[PDB]
Amino acid sequence: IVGGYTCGANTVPYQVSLNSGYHFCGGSLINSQWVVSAAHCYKSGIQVRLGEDNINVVEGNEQFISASKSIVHPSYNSNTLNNDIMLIKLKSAASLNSRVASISLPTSCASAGTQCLISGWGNTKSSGTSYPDVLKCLKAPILSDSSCKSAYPGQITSNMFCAGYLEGGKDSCQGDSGGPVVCSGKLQGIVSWGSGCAQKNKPGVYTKVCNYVSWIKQTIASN
Ligand SMILES: [Ca+2]
Structure with a gap:
């Protein structure tokens, strides 16, 4: 994170x-x-x-x-x-x-703009490597399908959603993979991929659990 x-x-x-x-x-x-x-x-x-x-x-x-x-x-x-x-x-x-x-499974899909908690023991630096020993947390919003697709042309499927910021600085990273993305007490996502970590116009991509x-x-x- x-x-x-x-x-x-x-x-x-x-x-x-x-x-x-x-x-x-x-x-x-x-x-x-x-x-x-x-x-x-x-x-x-x-x-x-x-x-x-x-x-x-x-x-x-x-x-x-x-x-x-x-x-x-x-x-x-x-x-x-x-x-x-x-x-x-x-x-x-x-x-x-x-x-x-x-953690409870979703009864309905989460929408863009909803805030979620992403967590894991992954890398904490965008450049270089630093592994935390204790669990790190990040509160981030689900991004619109439109901005997600625009950030990753021809790569986002209906089983994926982006979360974080286009500005960068905050994102999940290597080592957080497989981890949770929880919104309103429900597991809406799984840390899946992204281009590097917390880089501008390259938000995190998550598996759409719903x-x-x-x-x-x-x-x-x-x-
Ligand atoms: Ca322990």
Whole structure:
């Protein structure tokens, strides 16, 4: 997250860290044994880490649970990043409390102008690299489909939406991928891509979760 703020320990209870010996992506807990992330974050040997703040220090609220299976969206295109979404089932159900809790799925799509909370342990610099140990937060507005498409000609599909600013200075970044974009208490987006980080006229692009609700629910019901 570039230009964000320190969230505060466990103030984003649904935020998960995907660990394969190190943190490589974020994710969102949607129920006691399922996590939603980005398909481009796929890899084997995944351990889900819940209740995390500083990812390099055991602080007392962590729950480390290995994944039993990963399900990348049937139509995921890694070249265009269309349908950049995947589900991860936990080997054992997580213990849900106030510091570790699931986030509700949308009943309707979010609109341009709505403010959302984006979070993750990704890079905090637009130029150079600096990994935060604690969770960073960013409050940003959904941008119109028009400005999004104008910023990325021929690249934005109906399964994508931009959030942030055309001005730059504030955006999600490498390492935040797979993470949550929450608006009005609902998971509306997944950190997906963008050209660099927080650069002018290159806002963040997110997976439009509302389009996948049916698929998410159905998949869960049979797995
Ligand atoms: Ca920790």
